[PDB]
Design a protein around this ligand. Sequence first.
Ligand SMILES: *[C@@H]1O[C@H](CO)[C@@H](O[C@@H]2O[C@H](CO)[C@@H](O)[C@H](O)[C@H]2NC(C)=O)[C@H](O)[C@H]1NC(C)=O
Ligand SMILES: *[C@@H]1O[C@H](CO)[C@@H](O[C@@H]2O[C@H](CO)[C@@H](O)[C@H](O)[C@H]2NC(C)=O)[C@H](O)[C@H]1NC(C)=O
Ligand SMILES: *[C@@H]1O[C@H](CO)[C@@H](O[C@@H]2O[C@H](CO)[C@@H](O)[C@H](O)[C@H]2NC(C)=O)[C@H](O)[C@H]1NC(C)=O
Ligand SMILES: C[C@@H]1O[C@@H](O)[C@H](O)[C@H](O)[C@H]1O
Ligand SMILES: C[C@@H]1O[C@@H](O)[C@H](O)[C@H](O)[C@H]1O
Ligand SMILES: [Ca+2]
Ligand SMILES: [Ca+2]
Length: 338
Amino acid sequence: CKITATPSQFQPALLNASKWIWTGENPIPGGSNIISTRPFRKNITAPCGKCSVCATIVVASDDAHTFYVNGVRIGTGAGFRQGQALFVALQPTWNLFAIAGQNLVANSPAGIMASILVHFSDGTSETFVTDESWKTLRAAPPENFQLPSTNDSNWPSAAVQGAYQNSVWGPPVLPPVLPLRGSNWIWTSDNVNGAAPVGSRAFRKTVNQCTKVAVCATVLIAADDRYTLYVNGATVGSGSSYTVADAYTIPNLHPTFNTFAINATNGGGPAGVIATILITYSDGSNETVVTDASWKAIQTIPQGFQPPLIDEFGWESAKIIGAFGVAPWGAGMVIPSA
Ligand SMILES: *[C@@H]1O[C@H](CO)[C@@H](O[C@@H]2O[C@H](CO)[C@@H](O)[C@H](O)[C@H]2NC(C)=O)[C@H](O)[C@H]1NC(C)=O
Ligand SMILES: *[C@@H]1O[C@H](CO)[C@@H](O[C@@H]2O[C@H](CO)[C@@H](O)[C@H](O)[C@H]2NC(C)=O)[C@H](O)[C@H]1NC(C)=O
Ligand SMILES: *[C@@H]1O[C@H](CO)[C@@H](O[C@@H]2O[C@H](CO)[C@@H](O)[C@H](O)[C@H]2NC(C)=O)[C@H](O)[C@H]1NC(C)=O
Ligand SMILES: C[C@@H]1O[C@@H](O)[C@H](O)[C@H](O)[C@H]1O
Ligand SMILES: C[C@@H]1O[C@@H](O)[C@H](O)[C@H](O)[C@H]1O
Ligand SMILES: [Ca+2]
Ligand SMILES: [Ca+2]
Protein backbone atom coordinates (compact mmCIF):
# COMPACT_ATOMS: atom_id res chain seq x y z
CA CYS A 1 0.00 0.00 0.00
CA LYS A 2 3.02 2.26 0.56
CA ILE A 3 4.42 3.45 -2.78
CA THR A 4 8.22 3.28 -2.86
CA ALA A 5 8.33 3.43 -6.67
CA THR A 6 9.85 6.68 -7.96
CA PRO A 7 9.79 8.46 -11.36
CA SER A 8 11.53 6.41 -14.05
CA GLN A 9 11.98 6.13 -17.79
CA PHE A 10 8.71 4.93 -19.33
CA GLN A 11 8.56 1.14 -19.79
CA PRO A 12 6.67 0.08 -22.94
CA ALA A 13 3.95 -2.51 -22.79
CA LEU A 14 4.71 -5.04 -25.54
CA LEU A 15 2.41 -7.39 -27.42
CA ASN A 16 5.05 -10.09 -28.06
CA ALA A 17 3.66 -12.49 -25.44
CA SER A 18 0.00 -11.70 -26.09
CA LYS A 19 -2.60 -13.85 -27.87
CA TRP A 20 -5.58 -13.11 -30.08
CA ILE A 21 -8.80 -14.47 -28.57
CA TRP A 22 -12.37 -14.96 -29.72
CA THR A 23 -15.17 -17.38 -28.81
CA GLY A 24 -14.31 -20.46 -30.83
CA GLU A 25 -17.75 -20.48 -32.47
CA ASN A 26 -15.60 -21.32 -35.47
CA PRO A 27 -13.10 -23.93 -34.15
CA ILE A 28 -10.64 -22.87 -36.87
CA PRO A 29 -8.44 -20.10 -35.42
CA GLY A 30 -8.36 -17.14 -37.75
CA GLY A 31 -11.37 -18.65 -39.49
CA SER A 32 -14.48 -16.95 -40.78
CA ASN A 33 -16.91 -15.67 -38.14
CA ILE A 34 -20.33 -14.04 -38.22
CA ILE A 35 -21.08 -10.40 -37.52
CA SER A 36 -21.47 -10.37 -33.76
CA THR A 37 -20.48 -8.78 -30.45
CA ARG A 38 -18.80 -10.94 -27.81
CA PRO A 39 -17.67 -10.41 -24.19
CA PHE A 40 -14.28 -11.15 -22.64
CA ARG A 41 -13.39 -10.96 -18.93
CA LYS A 42 -10.34 -11.60 -16.76
CA ASN A 43 -9.99 -11.07 -13.02
CA ILE A 44 -6.30 -10.36 -12.34
CA THR A 45 -5.00 -10.43 -8.77
CA ALA A 46 -1.90 -8.73 -7.43
CA PRO A 47 0.93 -11.11 -6.48
CA CYS A 48 1.60 -11.69 -2.80
CA GLY A 49 2.99 -8.69 -0.94
CA LYS A 50 2.64 -6.04 -3.69
CA CYS A 51 -0.15 -3.58 -4.43
CA SER A 52 -1.04 -2.77 -8.01
CA VAL A 53 -1.09 0.97 -8.72
CA CYS A 54 -1.77 1.58 -12.43
CA ALA A 55 -1.44 0.01 -15.86
CA THR A 56 -0.24 0.80 -19.36
CA ILE A 57 -2.51 -1.04 -21.81
CA VAL A 58 -2.14 -1.82 -25.52
CA VAL A 59 -5.17 -3.33 -27.27
CA ALA A 60 -5.85 -4.33 -30.89
CA SER A 61 -9.00 -5.75 -32.43
CA ASP A 62 -10.57 -7.28 -35.48
CA ASP A 63 -12.75 -5.37 -35.92
CA ALA A 64 -13.54 -3.12 -32.91
CA HIS A 65 -13.39 -3.08 -29.13
CA THR A 66 -14.62 -1.37 -25.98
CA PHE A 67 -12.31 -1.71 -22.97
CA TYR A 68 -13.48 -1.66 -19.33
CA VAL A 69 -11.59 -1.72 -16.03
CA ASN A 70 -13.56 -2.55 -12.84
CA GLY A 71 -16.77 -1.60 -14.62
CA VAL A 72 -15.54 1.76 -16.01
CA ARG A 73 -15.31 2.36 -19.78
CA ILE A 74 -11.68 3.29 -20.43
CA GLY A 75 -11.52 3.44 -24.23
CA THR A 76 -13.01 2.44 -27.57
CA GLY A 77 -11.00 1.57 -30.67
CA ALA A 78 -10.69 -0.57 -33.77
CA GLY A 79 -8.17 -2.20 -36.04
CA PHE A 80 -5.43 -4.81 -35.86
CA ARG A 81 -2.59 -3.17 -37.81
CA GLN A 82 -1.79 -0.79 -34.95
CA GLY A 83 -2.62 -1.10 -31.27
CA GLN A 84 -4.34 1.45 -29.06
CA ALA A 85 -2.66 2.86 -25.93
CA LEU A 86 -4.78 3.25 -22.77
CA PHE A 87 -3.82 4.21 -19.19
CA VAL A 88 -5.75 3.48 -16.01
CA ALA A 89 -5.45 3.52 -12.24
CA LEU A 90 -6.02 0.16 -10.52
CA GLN A 91 -7.44 -1.27 -7.30
CA PRO A 92 -4.67 -2.54 -5.00
CA THR A 93 -5.30 -6.31 -4.96
CA TRP A 94 -7.59 -7.40 -7.82
CA ASN A 95 -8.85 -5.83 -11.04
CA LEU A 96 -11.55 -6.96 -13.47
CA PHE A 97 -10.68 -6.31 -17.12
CA ALA A 98 -13.57 -6.61 -19.55
CA ILE A 99 -13.61 -6.20 -23.33
CA ALA A 100 -16.51 -6.14 -25.75
CA GLY A 101 -15.19 -7.16 -29.16
CA GLN A 102 -17.11 -6.83 -32.42
CA ASN A 103 -16.75 -8.60 -35.75
CA LEU A 104 -18.11 -6.19 -38.36
CA VAL A 105 -17.58 -8.06 -41.67
CA ALA A 106 -19.37 -11.32 -42.44
CA ASN A 107 -17.28 -14.46 -43.10
CA SER A 108 -14.19 -12.69 -41.74
CA PRO A 109 -11.76 -13.38 -38.88
CA ALA A 110 -12.44 -11.99 -35.43
CA GLY A 111 -10.16 -11.37 -32.49
CA ILE A 112 -9.10 -9.31 -29.49
CA MET A 113 -5.49 -8.90 -28.35
CA ALA A 114 -4.29 -6.89 -25.39
CA SER A 115 -1.29 -6.47 -23.16
CA ILE A 116 -1.69 -5.06 -19.63
CA LEU A 117 1.54 -3.80 -18.02
CA VAL A 118 0.75 -3.46 -14.30
CA HIS A 119 2.98 -1.27 -12.14
CA PHE A 120 3.21 -2.22 -8.45
CA SER A 121 3.78 -0.13 -5.31
CA ASP A 122 7.36 -1.40 -4.91
CA GLY A 123 8.49 -0.29 -8.36
CA THR A 124 8.15 -3.65 -10.12
CA SER A 125 5.95 -4.45 -13.11
CA GLU A 126 4.35 -7.51 -14.68
CA THR A 127 2.67 -7.91 -18.09
CA PHE A 128 -0.68 -9.72 -18.35
CA VAL A 129 -2.19 -10.73 -21.71
CA THR A 130 -5.32 -11.97 -23.41
CA ASP A 131 -5.17 -15.78 -23.63
CA GLU A 132 -7.21 -18.94 -23.01
CA SER A 133 -7.64 -18.11 -19.30
CA TRP A 134 -10.07 -15.28 -20.19
CA LYS A 135 -13.81 -15.97 -19.98
CA THR A 136 -16.22 -15.38 -22.87
CA LEU A 137 -19.75 -16.21 -24.06
CA ARG A 138 -21.03 -17.57 -27.36
CA ALA A 139 -23.66 -14.81 -27.30
CA ALA A 140 -24.06 -11.05 -27.18
CA PRO A 141 -22.75 -9.50 -23.95
CA PRO A 142 -25.30 -9.56 -21.13
CA GLU A 143 -26.29 -6.25 -19.63
CA ASN A 144 -23.57 -5.13 -17.19
CA PHE A 145 -21.24 -7.95 -18.34
CA GLN A 146 -18.32 -5.65 -17.51
CA LEU A 147 -19.27 -5.05 -13.87
CA PRO A 148 -17.38 -6.93 -11.13
CA SER A 149 -20.70 -7.99 -9.60
CA THR A 150 -21.51 -10.12 -12.66
CA ASN A 151 -20.60 -13.78 -12.03
CA ASP A 152 -18.56 -15.28 -14.87
CA SER A 153 -17.88 -18.63 -13.16
CA ASN A 154 -20.06 -20.51 -15.67
CA TRP A 155 -18.61 -18.75 -18.73
CA PRO A 156 -16.51 -20.84 -21.16
CA SER A 157 -12.85 -20.13 -21.75
CA ALA A 158 -11.83 -17.88 -24.62
CA ALA A 159 -10.44 -19.60 -27.74
CA VAL A 160 -6.99 -18.54 -28.97
CA GLN A 161 -7.05 -17.29 -32.58
CA GLY A 162 -3.31 -16.83 -33.03
CA ALA A 163 -0.13 -15.53 -31.44
CA TYR A 164 1.80 -12.29 -31.88
CA GLN A 165 4.10 -13.80 -34.53
CA ASN A 166 1.78 -16.56 -35.78
CA SER A 167 -1.70 -15.36 -36.76
CA VAL A 168 -3.71 -14.24 -39.76
CA TRP A 169 -3.21 -10.64 -38.61
CA GLY A 170 0.57 -10.39 -38.29
CA PRO A 171 2.19 -8.40 -35.45
CA PRO A 172 0.39 -5.13 -34.67
CA VAL A 173 2.55 -2.02 -34.60
CA LEU A 174 2.81 -0.42 -31.17
CA PRO A 175 1.30 3.11 -31.08
CA PRO A 176 3.32 6.03 -29.69
CA VAL A 177 3.18 6.21 -25.89
CA LEU A 178 1.35 9.57 -26.18
CA PRO A 179 0.55 11.88 -29.12
CA LEU A 180 2.40 15.11 -29.77
CA ARG A 181 -0.40 16.05 -32.16
CA GLY A 182 -2.52 18.25 -29.95
CA SER A 183 0.45 19.85 -28.14
CA ASN A 184 2.40 23.02 -28.92
CA TRP A 185 5.99 24.08 -28.96
CA ILE A 186 6.16 26.81 -26.31
CA TRP A 187 8.78 29.29 -25.13
CA THR A 188 9.15 32.62 -23.38
CA SER A 189 8.00 35.64 -25.34
CA ASP A 190 11.61 36.58 -26.25
CA ASN A 191 11.17 33.92 -29.01
CA VAL A 192 10.47 36.08 -32.09
CA ASN A 193 11.08 35.80 -35.86
CA GLY A 194 12.08 32.13 -35.63
CA ALA A 195 14.88 32.48 -33.07
CA ALA A 196 15.31 33.06 -29.37
CA PRO A 197 18.21 34.29 -27.23
CA VAL A 198 20.76 31.85 -25.90
CA GLY A 199 19.89 30.90 -22.34
CA SER A 200 17.69 28.93 -19.97
CA ARG A 201 13.96 29.48 -19.47
CA ALA A 202 11.56 27.94 -16.96
CA PHE A 203 8.00 26.67 -17.46
CA ARG A 204 5.37 25.59 -14.90
CA LYS A 205 2.02 23.84 -15.03
CA THR A 206 -0.07 22.83 -12.01
CA VAL A 207 -2.90 20.30 -12.01
CA ASN A 208 -5.16 20.38 -8.96
CA GLN A 209 -8.46 18.49 -9.08
CA CYS A 210 -9.20 18.64 -5.36
CA THR A 211 -12.31 16.40 -5.61
CA LYS A 212 -10.38 13.54 -7.28
CA VAL A 213 -7.48 11.24 -6.44
CA ALA A 214 -4.61 11.35 -8.95
CA VAL A 215 -2.50 8.20 -9.24
CA CYS A 216 0.04 8.00 -12.10
CA ALA A 217 1.32 10.34 -14.79
CA THR A 218 2.95 9.54 -18.10
CA VAL A 219 5.03 12.36 -19.59
CA LEU A 220 6.32 12.75 -23.15
CA ILE A 221 8.70 15.66 -23.66
CA ALA A 222 11.23 17.16 -26.08
CA ALA A 223 12.99 20.53 -26.21
CA ASP A 224 14.87 22.43 -28.84
CA ASP A 225 18.33 22.03 -27.38
CA ARG A 226 17.65 20.64 -23.89
CA TYR A 227 15.46 20.38 -20.80
CA THR A 228 15.32 19.20 -17.23
CA LEU A 229 11.93 18.07 -15.95
CA TYR A 230 10.70 18.28 -12.33
CA VAL A 231 7.54 17.05 -10.64
CA ASN A 232 6.67 18.51 -7.22
CA GLY A 233 10.29 19.66 -7.01
CA ALA A 234 11.82 16.22 -7.59
CA THR A 235 14.02 15.67 -10.63
CA VAL A 236 12.34 13.34 -13.14
CA GLY A 237 14.80 13.38 -16.03
CA SER A 238 16.51 15.43 -18.67
CA GLY A 239 17.12 15.31 -22.40
CA SER A 240 19.08 17.09 -25.12
CA SER A 241 17.30 16.15 -28.36
CA TYR A 242 14.53 17.80 -30.34
CA THR A 243 14.28 14.80 -32.72
CA VAL A 244 14.01 11.97 -30.16
CA ALA A 245 11.41 12.54 -27.41
CA ASP A 246 11.66 11.15 -23.88
CA ALA A 247 8.90 9.40 -21.96
CA TYR A 248 8.59 9.07 -18.18
CA THR A 249 6.33 7.36 -15.67
CA ILE A 250 5.53 9.13 -12.40
CA PRO A 251 4.02 6.39 -10.22
CA ASN A 252 3.84 8.36 -6.96
CA LEU A 253 1.71 11.41 -7.72
CA HIS A 254 0.37 13.54 -4.92
CA PRO A 255 -3.36 12.73 -4.66
CA THR A 256 -4.66 16.24 -5.46
CA PHE A 257 -1.92 18.77 -6.33
CA ASN A 258 0.95 18.24 -8.76
CA THR A 259 3.31 20.78 -10.35
CA PHE A 260 5.33 20.07 -13.49
CA ALA A 261 8.33 22.37 -13.97
CA ILE A 262 10.84 22.54 -16.83
CA ASN A 263 14.23 24.22 -17.19
CA ALA A 264 14.74 24.34 -20.97
CA THR A 265 17.88 25.81 -22.52
CA ASN A 266 18.47 27.31 -25.96
CA GLY A 267 22.00 26.92 -27.33
CA GLY A 268 21.30 29.27 -30.25
CA GLY A 269 18.76 29.78 -33.02
CA PRO A 270 15.18 28.52 -32.72
CA ALA A 271 13.91 27.26 -29.38
CA GLY A 272 10.90 25.45 -27.97
CA VAL A 273 9.74 22.83 -25.53
CA ILE A 274 6.81 20.49 -26.15
CA ALA A 275 5.13 17.96 -23.88
CA THR A 276 2.05 15.81 -23.40
CA ILE A 277 1.02 14.57 -19.94
CA LEU A 278 -1.61 11.99 -19.07
CA ILE A 279 -2.78 11.71 -15.44
CA THR A 280 -4.90 8.75 -14.29
CA TYR A 281 -7.54 9.08 -11.56
CA SER A 282 -8.69 6.41 -9.11
CA ASP A 283 -12.25 6.58 -10.50
CA GLY A 284 -10.91 5.31 -13.83
CA SER A 285 -10.96 8.69 -15.55
CA ASN A 286 -7.92 10.51 -16.89
CA GLU A 287 -6.91 13.92 -18.10
CA THR A 288 -4.41 15.10 -20.70
CA VAL A 289 -2.27 18.22 -20.27
CA VAL A 290 -0.29 19.70 -23.18
CA THR A 291 2.20 22.53 -23.41
CA ASP A 292 0.14 25.59 -24.40
CA ALA A 293 -0.45 29.18 -23.30
CA SER A 294 -1.89 28.09 -19.92
CA TRP A 295 1.64 27.26 -18.79
CA LYS A 296 3.61 29.96 -17.00
CA ALA A 297 7.07 30.97 -18.18
CA ILE A 298 9.92 33.19 -17.00
CA GLN A 299 13.06 34.47 -18.71
CA THR A 300 15.38 34.68 -15.69
CA ILE A 301 15.04 31.49 -13.71
CA PRO A 302 14.57 32.27 -9.99
CA GLN A 303 15.89 30.19 -7.13
CA GLY A 304 13.44 27.39 -6.45
CA PHE A 305 11.63 27.71 -9.78
CA GLN A 306 10.65 24.00 -9.37
CA PRO A 307 8.96 23.79 -5.90
CA PRO A 308 5.20 23.26 -6.03
CA LEU A 309 4.00 26.31 -4.12
CA ILE A 310 6.15 29.29 -5.16
CA ASP A 311 4.86 32.78 -5.88
CA GLU A 312 4.23 32.95 -9.62
CA PHE A 313 4.15 36.76 -9.70
CA GLY A 314 6.27 37.97 -12.57
CA TRP A 315 5.81 34.79 -14.63
CA GLU A 316 4.17 35.34 -18.00
CA SER A 317 1.84 33.14 -19.98
CA ALA A 318 4.04 30.92 -22.14
CA LYS A 319 4.09 31.81 -25.84
CA ILE A 320 2.83 29.29 -28.39
CA ILE A 321 5.57 29.00 -30.99
CA GLY A 322 3.43 26.64 -33.08
CA ALA A 323 1.35 23.51 -32.91
CA PHE A 324 3.27 20.24 -33.22
CA GLY A 325 4.45 19.82 -36.82
CA VAL A 326 5.50 23.39 -37.63
CA ALA A 327 8.88 24.14 -39.12
CA PRO A 328 11.68 23.97 -38.25
CA TRP A 329 11.20 20.76 -36.26
CA GLY A 330 8.52 19.13 -38.41
CA ALA A 331 6.41 16.07 -37.66
CA GLY A 332 9.06 13.33 -37.54
CA MET A 333 9.82 13.21 -33.78
CA VAL A 334 10.81 9.72 -32.67
CA ILE A 335 8.32 8.80 -29.92
CA PRO A 336 8.75 5.76 -27.62
CA SER A 337 6.27 2.93 -28.17
CA ALA A 338 3.33 2.55 -25.76
C1 LIG B 1 -9.53 8.79 -20.97
O1 LIG B 1 -10.85 8.67 -20.64
C2 LIG B 1 -11.77 8.98 -21.70
C3 LIG B 1 -13.15 8.57 -21.22
O2 LIG B 1 -13.14 8.09 -19.88
C4 LIG B 1 -11.41 8.34 -23.06
O3 LIG B 1 -11.66 9.35 -24.04
C5 LIG B 1 -13.00 9.49 -24.60
O4 LIG B 1 -13.50 8.18 -25.06
C6 LIG B 1 -13.01 7.70 -26.33
C7 LIG B 1 -12.46 6.31 -26.09
O5 LIG B 1 -11.20 6.14 -26.74
C8 LIG B 1 -11.96 8.63 -26.90
O6 LIG B 1 -11.54 8.12 -28.17
C9 LIG B 1 -12.57 10.01 -27.09
O7 LIG B 1 -11.60 10.92 -27.61
C10 LIG B 1 -13.12 10.56 -25.76
N1 LIG B 1 -14.48 11.04 -25.94
C11 LIG B 1 -14.83 12.20 -26.53
C12 LIG B 1 -13.71 13.10 -26.99
O8 LIG B 1 -16.01 12.52 -26.67
C13 LIG B 1 -9.96 7.88 -23.24
O9 LIG B 1 -9.93 6.62 -23.90
C14 LIG B 1 -9.18 7.71 -21.93
N2 LIG B 1 -7.75 7.68 -22.20
C15 LIG B 1 -6.94 6.68 -21.80
C16 LIG B 1 -7.58 5.61 -21.00
O10 LIG B 1 -5.75 6.67 -22.07
C1 LIG C 1 -11.23 -11.34 -8.17
O1 LIG C 1 -10.51 -12.25 -7.33
C2 LIG C 1 -10.41 -11.80 -5.97
C3 LIG C 1 -9.47 -12.75 -5.26
O2 LIG C 1 -9.70 -14.10 -5.63
C4 LIG C 1 -11.80 -11.74 -5.35
O3 LIG C 1 -11.69 -11.23 -4.02
C5 LIG C 1 -12.11 -12.14 -2.97
O4 LIG C 1 -13.53 -12.20 -2.82
C6 LIG C 1 -13.94 -13.10 -1.78
C7 LIG C 1 -15.44 -13.28 -1.89
O5 LIG C 1 -16.12 -12.03 -1.84
C8 LIG C 1 -13.49 -12.53 -0.44
O6 LIG C 1 -13.93 -13.37 0.62
C9 LIG C 1 -11.97 -12.41 -0.44
O7 LIG C 1 -11.56 -11.73 0.74
C10 LIG C 1 -11.46 -11.63 -1.66
N1 LIG C 1 -10.02 -11.73 -1.75
C11 LIG C 1 -9.23 -10.70 -2.07
C12 LIG C 1 -7.75 -10.99 -2.13
O8 LIG C 1 -9.68 -9.58 -2.29
C13 LIG C 1 -12.68 -10.80 -6.18
O9 LIG C 1 -14.02 -10.84 -5.71
C14 LIG C 1 -12.67 -11.19 -7.66
N2 LIG C 1 -13.39 -10.20 -8.44
C15 LIG C 1 -14.28 -10.53 -9.38
C16 LIG C 1 -14.93 -9.39 -10.10
O10 LIG C 1 -14.54 -11.70 -9.65
C1 LIG D 1 19.12 25.12 -16.14
O1 LIG D 1 19.80 24.40 -17.18
C2 LIG D 1 21.13 24.86 -17.49
C3 LIG D 1 21.69 23.87 -18.48
O2 LIG D 1 21.23 22.56 -18.20
C4 LIG D 1 22.02 24.99 -16.24
O3 LIG D 1 23.25 25.63 -16.56
C5 LIG D 1 24.38 24.75 -16.29
O4 LIG D 1 24.81 24.82 -14.96
C6 LIG D 1 25.83 23.85 -14.77
C7 LIG D 1 25.81 23.45 -13.31
O5 LIG D 1 25.35 22.11 -13.17
C8 LIG D 1 27.12 24.49 -15.22
O6 LIG D 1 28.18 23.54 -15.20
C9 LIG D 1 26.99 25.13 -16.60
O7 LIG D 1 27.48 26.47 -16.54
C10 LIG D 1 25.57 25.13 -17.26
N1 LIG D 1 25.55 24.27 -18.43
C11 LIG D 1 24.93 24.60 -19.57
C12 LIG D 1 25.00 23.58 -20.67
O8 LIG D 1 24.36 25.69 -19.71
C13 LIG D 1 21.30 25.75 -15.13
O9 LIG D 1 22.08 25.77 -13.95
C14 LIG D 1 19.95 25.09 -14.88
N2 LIG D 1 19.27 25.66 -13.72
C15 LIG D 1 18.96 26.95 -13.60
C16 LIG D 1 18.25 27.33 -12.33
O10 LIG D 1 19.24 27.78 -14.46
C1 LIG E 1 -8.85 -9.19 -41.68
C2 LIG E 1 -10.19 -8.77 -42.27
O1 LIG E 1 -9.97 -7.63 -43.09
C3 LIG E 1 -11.16 -7.17 -43.75
O2 LIG E 1 -11.77 -8.17 -44.58
C4 LIG E 1 -12.13 -6.71 -42.66
O3 LIG E 1 -11.52 -5.73 -41.84
C5 LIG E 1 -12.49 -7.91 -41.79
O4 LIG E 1 -13.38 -7.51 -40.78
C6 LIG E 1 -11.22 -8.47 -41.18
O5 LIG E 1 -11.53 -9.62 -40.43
C1 LIG F 1 16.75 24.09 -35.57
C2 LIG F 1 18.16 24.44 -35.09
O1 LIG F 1 19.11 23.58 -35.69
C3 LIG F 1 20.44 24.00 -35.43
O2 LIG F 1 20.62 25.35 -35.83
C4 LIG F 1 20.72 23.83 -33.93
O3 LIG F 1 20.58 22.47 -33.58
C5 LIG F 1 19.74 24.67 -33.11
O4 LIG F 1 19.90 24.43 -31.72
C6 LIG F 1 18.30 24.38 -33.55
O5 LIG F 1 17.46 25.36 -32.98
CA1 LIG G 1 -13.50 -9.22 -38.99
CA1 LIG H 1 18.18 26.05 -30.59
